[PDB]
Structure formats: structure tokens, C-alpha cells
């Protein structure tokens, strides 16, 4: 029974390592490094892979592992793939974690865009959760803390994290997590997956898949949403992707929204996406 060493960077930039027979399907991975982490809420996390076009794949689980990473490297990213509405109802403080750190990459890398004073308020609530109660004689008019926060530092910025950290003593790990998770989760690009295509008439938009629906990015003053009740069926063809979008209140016909991607790899990813989606919205 012959073994593949994989290759995990989790979510605090650890890396885990360890060995699965080669014909493993991903769950056998997934439930690895989940055991690692002692996460037992772990439908709502997955992991990643890059292809050589160093594109980010979801691992499906339910598929073996060498027929998706393919040529490429055993190498993986553990990742929140379904980001809960309401991070309160989540059964454990160890899922909230896990989902803070998956929002601190989100917010440092500016897939996750937030004003200067949520940056500072999350960073403050990062501070809190991790050192405890502000502490002067870790502190100075200069400091420039180890944690990111933002995905450009600014001193105006640290100065703001270390001035709501002194507002949040007594405050316990788990109540400043659930504070930055109260927080995070108003953003308007919570839990938003942007894919790159075009609208029937060649003009770019990004695509934006999240638990709510599908949205689209036209321009700051044209932005379309369609909630999942109102998503019927979800289509890949060649570089084309399709959604079916229900007859308004007493109209006669379904109408089909298309879109071009990239190539026939990103339409196919867009749609397994949204139909993971799709089905995580009926289970709300
Ligand atoms: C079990 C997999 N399924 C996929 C949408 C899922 C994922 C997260 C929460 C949940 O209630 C269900």
C-alpha cells in the first residue's frame, strides 16, 4: 500500500505534514488535518490546491486526490470554504477561531476590503484575544506590532489598534473573537468568492458567490443580485457559464443570464462553487 506525503499550510501559516495511501480520496486528507486541529465543526472548511496556472481549487473530497492534483505538487492550503451568516450559532469557540484566522488572511491580503476603523477595531480584537489586557510596558509613542492587520500599515492605523486595545480589558479570547466575528461579518464582502468574466456583451464584471446568492460587479453604481430561492439551475459550457433566474411574479418564462470566462477550467470552478453554495443556502 503505497503512501504520498502531503503537505498542509494552516491557517496561523503552520504546516502540517503527513502520509496518505495514494489512492486516498481528499476526506481522508481533510479528516487528517482536521484531527490535527481538533475541529469538529468541519463542514464548513475544506482545502485548496494550486495548478501550475497557480490558480486556487477547492480539494473535493468525495474524489481522489491524484485525480485532481493531477501533475502538480501534494501540496495544500487548509481554507473556511462555507463562511457562516451568523459565526454565533456556530456550536464551538475552537470553529470561531478558525474562522478569525481564515478573516485576518481575508483582511491582510484585501480580498476582504474594510474601512480604516474595522481594520483597527478587528486588529484590536486580535491583540485582546491573543495577549490579553493592553499593557503599556509592551507599548510606545513608535510601536509597530507583529500582528497584520491591514493589507497597507500605517502608523495612524497601529496607533488606532493600541488605542481600542486599552478599551477592551478583561475582555476573554472568546468574547473578543466573537466580537471580531460580529463585526467582520456586516462587511459587505464577507464570505464573497470573486471570479473574473464578461456579461453577454464582452464588458468585464466580477462574479461574486456567497451564501446569500450570486452577485454581480459591473461598476460601483451597476450591481446585481440574485438571492439562491431565485436560481433555478447553474450551467458550464465550453468558456460559458449560465444561470437560470425564475419568471417574476406572474411572467411566463424562466430567463438565462450568461457569461464568459477566462477559459473552460474557471467556468467549470465558478460552477462547482456556486452549486456548493446553492445547496449550503437550503440547509440555512
Ligand atoms: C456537509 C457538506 N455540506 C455542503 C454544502 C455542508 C457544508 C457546511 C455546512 C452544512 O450544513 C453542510
Same mark, same amino acid.
Given at each position: 500500500?503505497?503512501?504520498?506525503?502531503?503537505?498542509?499550510?494552516?491557517?496561523?501559516?503552520?504546516?502540517?505534514?503527513?502520509?496518505?495511501?495514494?489512492?486516498?480520496?481528499?476526506?481522508?486528507?481533510?479528516?487528517?488535518?482536521?484531527?490535527?486541529?481538533?475541529?469538529?465543526?468541519?463542514?464548513?472548511?475544506?482545502?485548496?490546491?494550486?495548478?501550475?496556472?497557480?490558480?486556487?481549487?477547492?480539494?473535493?473530497?468525495?474524489?481522489?486526490?491524484?485525480?485532481?492534483?493531477?501533475?502538480?505538487?501534494? $501540496?495544500?492550503?487548509?481554507?473556511?470554504?462555507?463562511?457562516?451568516?451568523?459565526?454565533?450559532?456556530?456550536?464551538?469557540?475552537?470553529?470561531?477561531?478558525?474562522?478569525?484566522?481564515?478573516?485576518?488572511?481575508?483582511?491582510?491580503?484585501?480580498?476582504?476590503? /474594510?474601512?480604516?476603523?474595522?481594520?483597527?477595531?478587528? *486588529?484590536?480584537?486580535?491583540?485582546?484575544?491573543?495577549?490579553?489586557?493592553?499593557?503599556?510596558?509592551?507599548?510606545?509613542?513608535?510601536?509597530?506590532?507583529?500582528?497584520?492587520?491591514?493589507?497597507?500599515?500605517?502608523?495612524?492605523?497601529?496607533?488606532?489598534?493600541?488605542?481600542?486595545?486599552?478599551?477592551?480589558?478583561?475582555?476573554?479570547?472568546?468574547?473578543?473573537?466573537? $466580537?471580531?466575528?460580529?463585526?467582520?461579518?456586516?462587511?459587505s464582502?464577507?464570505?464573497?468568492?470573486?471570479?473574473?468574466?464578461?456579461?453577454?456583451? *464582452?464588458?468585464?464584471?466580477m462574479?461574486?458567490? /456567497?451564501?446569500?446568492?450570486?452577485?454581480?460587479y459591473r461598476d460601483r453604481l451597476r450591481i446585481?443580485?440574485?438571492?439562491?430561492?431565485?436560481?433555478?439551475?447553474?450551467?458550464?459550457?465550453?468558456?460559458?457559464?449560465?444561470?437560470?433566474?425564475?419568471? *417574476?411574479?406572474?411572467?411566463?418564462?424562466?430567463?438565462?443570464?450568461?457569461?464568459?470566462?477566462?477559459?473552460?477550467?474557471?467556468?467549470?470552478?465558478?460552477?462547482?462553487? /456556486?452549486?456548493?453554495? $446553492?445547496?449550503?443556502?437550503?440547509?440555512?
Amino acid at each position: 500500500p503505497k503512501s504520498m506525503q502531503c503537505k498542509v499550510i494552516l491557517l496561523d501559516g503552520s504546516e502540517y505534514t503527513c502520509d496518505v495511501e495514494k489512492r486516498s480520496r481528499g476526506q481522508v486528507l481533510f479528516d487528517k488535518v482536521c484531527e490535527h486541529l481538533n475541529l469538529l465543526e468541519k463542514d464548513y472548511f475544506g482545502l485548496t490546491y494550486r495548478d501550475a496556472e497557480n490558480q486556487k481549487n477547492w480539494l473535493d473530497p468525495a474524489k481522489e486526490i491524484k485525480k485532481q492534483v493531477r501533475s502538480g505538487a501534494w $501540496h495544500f492550503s487548509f481554507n473556511v470554504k462555507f463562511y457562516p451568516p451568523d459565526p454565533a450559532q456556530l456550536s464551538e469557540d475552537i470553529t470561531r477561531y478558525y474562522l478569525c484566522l481564515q478573516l485576518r488572511d481575508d483582511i491582510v491580503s484585501g480580498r476582504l476590503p /474594510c474601512s480604516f476603523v474595522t481594520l483597527a477595531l478587528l *486588529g484590536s480584537y486580535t491583540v485582546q484575544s491573543e495577549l490579553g489586557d493592553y499593557d503599556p510596558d509592551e507599548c510606545g509613542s513608535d510601536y509597530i506590532s507583529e500582528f497584520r492587520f491591514a493589507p497597507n500599515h500605517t502608523k495612524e492605523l497601529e496607533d488606532k489598534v493600541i488605542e481600542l486595545h486599552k478599551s477592551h480589558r478583561g475582555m476573554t479570547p472568546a468574547e473578543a473573537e466573537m $466580537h471580531f466575528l460580529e463585526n467582520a461579518k456586516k462587511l459587505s464582502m464577507y464570505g464573497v468568492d470573486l471570479h473574473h468574466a464578461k456579461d453577454s456583451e *464582452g464588458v468585464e464584471i466580477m462574479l461574486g458567490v /456567497c451564501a446569500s446568492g450570486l452577485l454581480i460587479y459591473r461598476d460601483r453604481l451597476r450591481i446585481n443580485r440574485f438571492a439562491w430561492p431565485k436560481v433555478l439551475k447553474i450551467s458550464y459550457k465550453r468558456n460559458n457559464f449560465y444561470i437560470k433566474i425564475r419568471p *417574476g411574479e406572474f411572467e411566463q418564462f424562466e430567463s438565462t443570464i450568461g457569461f464568459k470566462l477566462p477559459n473552460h477550467r474557471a467556468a467549470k470552478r465558478l460552477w462547482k462553487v /456556486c452549486v456548493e453554495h $446553492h445547496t449550503f443556502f437550503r440547509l440555512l
